[PDB]
Design a protein around this ligand. Structure first.
Ligand SMILES: *[C@H]1O[C@H](CO)[C@@H](O[C@@H]2O[C@H](CO)[C@@H](O[C@@H]3O[C@H](CO[C@H]4O[C@H](CO)[C@@H](O)[C@H](O)[C@@H]4O)[C@@H](O)[C@H](O[C@H]4O[C@H](CO)[C@@H](O)[C@H](O)[C@@H]4O)[C@@H]3O)[C@H](O)[C@H]2NC(C)=O)[C@H](O)[C@H]1NC(C)=O
Ligand code: 0G6
Ligand code: 0G6
Ligand code: 0G6
Ligand code: 0G6
Ligand SMILES: *[C@H]1O[C@H](CO)[C@@H](O[C@@H]2O[C@H](CO)[C@@H](O)[C@H](O)[C@H]2NC(C)=O)[C@H](O)[C@H]1NC(C)=O
Ligand SMILES: *[C@H]1O[C@H](CO)[C@@H](O[C@H]2O[C@H](CO)[C@@H](O)[C@H](O)[C@H]2NC(C)=O)[C@H](O)[C@H]1NC(C)=O
Ligand SMILES: *[C@H]1O[C@H](CO)[C@@H](O[C@H]2O[C@H](CO)[C@@H](O)[C@H](O)[C@H]2NC(C)=O)[C@H](O)[C@H]1NC(C)=O
Ligand code: NA
Ligand code: NA
Ligand code: NA
Ligand code: NA
Lengths: 253, 31, 256, 31, 254, 32, 254, 29
C-alpha cells in the first residue's frame, strides 16, 4: 500500500495472508468470506509468464494478523488449503481478465474479535455503491512504494475513490474489461494512494450507508507502477463474478 | 458466518467508528 | 399443439391463458410461478412487426382452465395485470433472443387442486435435465396444425405433447435464423418416427420436465418460435429459462 | 408466495397418482 | 430421379442402362469408364434380401441412350457382359457398405458423340471436389417419385445436388454409415429439392473439375429411405475411397 | 481403352459449349 | 547385423547411412528410392521415450558407402535433408506400428555403379514374394550382436526367411499389426542371423524371379534382443504403406 | 524410375552376387 497508514487493531478482521511454504515468502493478500472459504486473485496462484503455478500443499494462510512479521499469540490462526479453484476463464495471457480464485480451507476457522468474514455484494449494494467518486478501502502488507531494486511491519490501509470507466480505459494501453474497475486519485485532486505489488488478492471494501455492513467490491489485481500520476489501480469486479463464486461454494461447499 | 458478515467485533458491534470510515461515507454523498 | 392429446384434469395446474379484451381473443399461453407472478413470451406482449404492443389494461389472464371455450364454475379464475416486464434486451427486431416477459397480477390468486405454481430450475436441476434426448412436456390451446390463415383448427381442451430436447448443432443446422444460448430446441428427428410440436398460439406456454430427483415439475422453457409446425427436419424453439433466471429473480425481488 | 410447494400437483404427486404419460419422460432420462 | 429435369442430348455420354433379359426390365443405371469397363452398384447384381443374384448372361447393357424406351438408330449400342466383379467386402447383409461392382464388356464399345467415358478421380481431384456444399450431378431413368408398388421417365433425368456434412448424413438415419459412402441433397432450410430414387442405383454422381474442365465420377447411387423427403439424404458409394479396388480389377483382368 | 480423353463431352466441352446447368455446379465450388 | 558377412562392392547400391551432426553419430540405416527420396524408420527420427526428436538440420545422409569409416574416393556422396515426413499415425507409444518415414534430399543425388535406387513393390510383386519361407536380405552397419555393455567396418549382409504371422504373434507379448512382418530362422532350422540395434531403417529386400529386380519389402523396425532363439526381427510392411509413400512423393516431390 | 532394382555391378553386367541364389532357391516350394 502506497501513501496509506497503519491499520487499527481489528479494523480489517477479514484480512488474510497467503504464504509460500518453501522458500518462506508472503505472496499476496486475501479475504475471509466464510469459516471455510478465502477469496484472492488468480495470478497469486497461477501466472505462467513468471513460472508460477502453486498447488494446495505449497501454501498456507494466516488469519487475524496485524503485525506482518512479529507473531501474535491467541489471536492469529493458520489454515491449510483443501482445494484451489481458479476461474476457468482467467486470462493470464493478456490482461488478467477475471483475476479471481477461491481457496477452501481444510478445517473451519473460528471467528473472534480479530477474525470475521466480510460480505459479498448483492445486486442493490453494487448498484448503490459502485459509482465514480465513491471511496473504497484497500488493505495489505505489500510494497510501500513502486520498487525496482520497503515492506510494512503492520497492515496498511488506504481509502481511494472509484474512477469513471472512460478514464480507466484511456489511462492504459492494456485492454480493460467489465470484470475489472479502477480506483485512485486523479492528478489534479492532490491526494495520493494506491495498492502495489504484494497487495494482490487483498480486498477493496466499502461500508454500506444503508445497513452499516462492509462489502468487498473488488480484489487488488494489477497496475502499472504504483501511485503514478495518471495511472490507477485495477481491481477484479467481485459482483460481476459473484455468480461464479456462489456456484463454486455451493457445488464444493 | 454469513448473516453476520461485514460487522466488525471491535467496531460496528461496539458502536465504535474507526479513524477514517467517515471519509468513505462523505464520498457517498454526491456534491 | 400438433400431434398432442387432451390433457387430464389438473395435469398442468400452472397453465395460464393470456386474453385480449377487445376484440376478444386468446393470444398466448403462460405459466404461474407464484400467487402474484406469471411468466410468458415477450412477443405475446410486444412485437412491432405484427403491430403488437399491448399495455396492462388491454389484457386479462384466465387460470385453472381445461376447456378452451366453456366456463368452469368454482374452478377457473381471472386476474388483471398490474404491470408488464419485458426483458430489456428482448430482440424483436431480429431473432427473438430473450423472448421472455413477466406479468404481475393486481391481486394474488388462490391455489387449489387446479391452480398451483410450477418450479423454476436451479443450477443443478438445469444441469441434470437439460440434455439432448431428455423429454419435456409442452401444453397449450394453440393451433392443432400448421395454419396460414389470419384467423381455425383450435382445440376444445388443453393439449399436451412430450418432446425430446435436441443437440445444439442439429438445432442450428435446421434453420437459417440465428440461434443463441438463450434458446434451445425440441422435437423428434425425421428418423425417429414419432411427431409433435407446439404451434402458433402456443407461445408463452411452458416446456416442463419432471425431476427424477425430487419428484417436482420444473419449467425449463417457454414456447417461443418455429417455422411452420411439426415439419420433418424442423424443430420448435423455446426460451431458455435457467439462462435468464437472474433476470426473472431480479424483477421479482425489485418489484415484488 | 407459493414456491416451497412448487411443482407438486394437487391431483397427482400430492395424492401419489401418476398422469398417463409422465413415465415416458422418466424413461427418457435414462440413457 | 425426383424433381430433376430432362437431360440434354449427349449431356451424359457415359450413361449406361443395365437390363434384365427375361423378363425384360430396366434394373439400374451404370457408367462407362473405358471401352471395356462399366461401373455400377453391387446390389444391382447381388442382393439376396431381394432374391437377386444375377449371372453375366442374365443381363445386357445399352449405351448412348436418351429415351427410356424408344430405339435410337445409329446412336445407341448394346453390349454383353463377359464377367461381373463384385467388391469382395460388399456388405449386402447389413448396410450396403462398398456397394460397387465392375462389369467387363465382351467386346469393346466404340466412342461417339453420344458414347464417351467419364473420368475416375485421383487423390488431388477428390480433395478438391469432395467438400460439403459442393454440388454434383445425378442421372437416371429411375422413379420420378417415391413409389411403394412392387413394380418411369420417357427421357434420361438429371438433377444437381450438394454434398452434405458427414455429421448431418449420420444423424439423418439409423442405418450405420461408413467412410465408403457420402450423402447428398438439400437440407430442409435450403428450400430446393431433388434426389435419386429406386431404379437410379448404379448411376453416376459426377462433378466437373474447375481445374481441368473434365467430369469425374465421385459417387454411385447406392441407397436412401423414401425419395426426396425433408431431412433425408441420398447415399452414394465413395468412388475414390474404393479406387484401389477398381484399379486392381482392371489391371488383373483387363 | 479411353482415359486420356475421359470426362470431355463431344457435344459440349469439345465444342466449347456449356450445358444448361453446369454453371450451377461451378458456383457451388466458390464458398461464401 | 548378427551372423551376417561382409557385403560385396556395389552389392547394395541403395544403401544409405543416417548420421547425426553433433555429437557425431551413425544413427540408422535407410534406402534410396529415387534421386531425391530416402526411406527409413520413423523411430530413427522420432522416439520421445528416449528423448529423440530430430529436425532436418540435425542430420545428414551418406550414400554409396562400403567401409563404415575410411572415406571412399569419388564414390560416396553426402546430402542434406530438405524435409522429413513421418507417418502421421506412427505409434511410438506402444508397438511402433507404421514405423516409416521419408526424407527429401535438398539436391538430387547422381546415380553411379555404387549409388542406385531400389524398387518399391507393386501389387503382384508383394503377392508373389511375401510368403512364409521366402528369404529376403537385410543390410546395415549396426551391432554385430546383442550388446548391453561392437560395430562393423564394412556393410554387413544376411539372408533371412519370412515367418508365418501366427508364429510372429506368438513369439512376443507386444501387439503386432498387419503393418509389420517378421523374419528369421526358427530354433531348430539350424542357421541363424538377425538385424540388431543400429540396423533400423535399413532395407529388407527380395530379388524378383519374375523380372530380376530387387524390391524393398520391409524396413528394419524392431526386435527383442538380437538373434535369440524363439525371437524374430520385425520389419515395417512397405507394400501396405505404399499408398502413403506415393502420396507424400507426389504431393511434395516437385 | 524404370531402372530401379538393377545393380550396375551385378544385374547390369550379368553377374550374380555370392548369395542371391539362396534367395531364389527359397522361392521354390
Ligand atoms: C500448472 O499447474 C498444473 C501442474 O502444476 C497443470 O495442470 C495439470 O496438468 C496435467 C498435465 O500436464 C493434467 O493431467 C492431465 O489430465 C488429463 C485429464 O484427466 C484427469 O482425470 C482426473 C480428473 O478428475 C485426474 O485424476 C487426472 O490426474 C487428470 O487430471 C489427462 O487426460 C492427461 O493424461 C495424459 O494425456 C497425454 C496422453 O496422451 C499425456 O501426454 C499427458 O502427459 C497426460 O499424462 C493428464 O493426466 C492435470 O489434470 C492438470 N491439473 C490441473 C490442476 O489443472 C497446469 O497445466 C499448469 N498451468 C498452466 C496451464 O500453465
Ligand atoms: C499480484 C499482485 O500483487 C500485483 C498488484 C499490483 C497492484 N498495482 C497497483 N498499481 N495498484 N499484480 C501484478 O503484479 C500483476 C500480475 C502480473 C503482472 N501484474 C501487473 O500489474 C503488471 N504491472 C501489469 C500487467 C501485466 C500483464 C497483464 C496485466 C497487467
Ligand atoms: C407467439 C407464439 O405463439 C409463436 C409460436 C410458434 C411455435 N412454433 C413451433 N413450430 N413450435 N411464435 C411466433 O409466431 C414467432 C413470433 C414472431 C414470428 N414467430 C415465428 O415463429 C416465425 N415463424 C419465425 C421467426 C420470425 C422472426 C424472428 C424469429 C422467428
Ligand atoms: C438399387 C438402387 O436402385 C436403390 C436406390 C435408392 C436411392 N434412394 C435415394 N433416396 N436416393 N437402392 C436401394 O433400393 C437399396 C438396396 C437395398 C435396399 N435399398 C435401400 O435404399 C433401402 N431403402 C434402405 C437400406 C436397406 C438395407 C441396407 C441399406 C439401405
Ligand atoms: C531403431 C532400430 O535401430 C532398432 C532395431 C532393432 C532390430 N532388432 C532385431 N532383433 N532385428 N529398433 C529399436 O531399437 C526399437 C525402437 C524402440 C525400441 N525398439 C525395440 O526394438 C525394443 N527392443 C522393443 C520395442 C519396445 C517398444 C516398442 C516396440 C518394440
Ligand atoms: C409501444 O409501446 C409504447 C406505447 O405504450 C411506446 O412508447 C411509449 O410511448 C412513448 C413513446 O414515444 C414514451 O414516451 C413512453 O414512455 C412509452 N411507454 C413506456 C413507458 O413504455 C413504445 O415506443 C412502443 N414499443 C416499441 C418498441 O415499438
Ligand atoms: C448366388 O450366386 C451364385 C450362383 O451362381 C452362388 O455361388 C455358389 O453357388 C453354390 C451355393 O453356394 C456353390 O456350390 C457354388 O460353388 C457357387 N457358384 C460359383 C461361384 O460358381 C452364390 O453363393 C450366391 N450368392 C449369394 C451369397 O447369395
Ligand atoms: C518434437 O519435434 C518438434 C520440436 O519442437 C515439436 O514440434 C512442435 O513444437 C511445439 C510443441 O507443440 C509446437 O508449438 C510447434 O508448432 C510444433 N512444430 C511443428 C510445426 O511441427 C514436436 O511436437 C515434437 N514431437 C514430439 C511428439 O515430441
Ligand atoms: Na495515480
Ligand atoms: Na419436426
Ligand atoms: Na431430402
Ligand atoms: Na532368432
Amino acid at each position: 500500500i502506497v501513501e496509506g497508514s497503519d491499520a487499527e487493531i481489528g479494523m480489517s478482521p477479514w484480512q488474510v495472508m497467503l504464504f509460500r511454504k518453501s522458500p518462506q515468502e508472503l505472496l499476496c493478500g486475501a479475504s475471509l468470506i466464510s469459516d471455510r472459504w478465502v477469496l484472492t486473485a488468480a495470478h497469486c496462484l497461477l501466472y505462467p509468464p513468471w513460472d508460477k503455478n502453486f498447488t494446495e500443499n505449497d501454501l498456507l494462510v494466516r488469519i487475524g494478523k496485524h503485525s506482518r512479521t512479529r507473531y501474535e499469540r491467541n489471536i492469529e490462526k493458520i489454515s491449510m488449503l483443501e482445494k484451489i479453484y481458479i476461474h476457468p476463464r482467467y486470462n493470464w495471457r493478456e490482461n488478467l481478465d477475471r483475476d479471481i480464485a477461491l481457496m477452501k480451507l481444510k478445517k473451519p476457522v473460528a471467528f473472534s474479535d480479530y477474525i470475521h468474514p466480510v460480505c459479498l455484494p448483492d445486486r442493490e449494494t453494487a448498484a448503490s455503491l459502485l459509482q465514480a467518486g465513491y471511496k473504497g478501502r484497500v488493505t495489505g502488507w505489500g510494497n510501500l512504494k513502486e520498487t525496482w531494486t520497503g515492506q510494512p511491519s503492520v497492515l496498511q490501509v488506504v481509502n481511494l475513490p472509484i474512477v469513471e470507466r472512460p478514464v480507466c480505459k484511456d489511462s492504459t494501453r492494456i485492454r480493460i474489461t467489465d470484470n475489472m474497475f479502477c480506483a485512485g486519485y486523479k492528478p489534479d485532486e492532490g491526494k495520493r494512494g494506491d495498492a502495489c505489488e504484494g497487495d494482490s488478492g487483498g480486498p477493496f471494501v466499502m461500508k454500506s450507508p444503508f445497513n452499516n455492513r462492509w462489502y468487498q467490491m473488488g480484489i487488488v489485481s494489477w497496475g502499472e507502477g504504483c501511485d503514478r500520476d495518471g495511472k490507477y489501480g485495477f481491481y477484479t469486479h467481485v459482483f460481476r463474478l459473484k455468480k461464479w463464486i456462489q456456484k463454486v461454494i455451493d457445488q464444493f461447499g | 458466518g454469513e448473516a453476520d458478515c461485514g460487522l466488525r467485533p471491535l467496531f460496528e458491534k461496539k458502536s465504535l467508528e474507526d479513524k477514517t470510515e467517515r471519509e468513505l461515507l462523505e464520498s457517498y454523498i454526491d456534491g
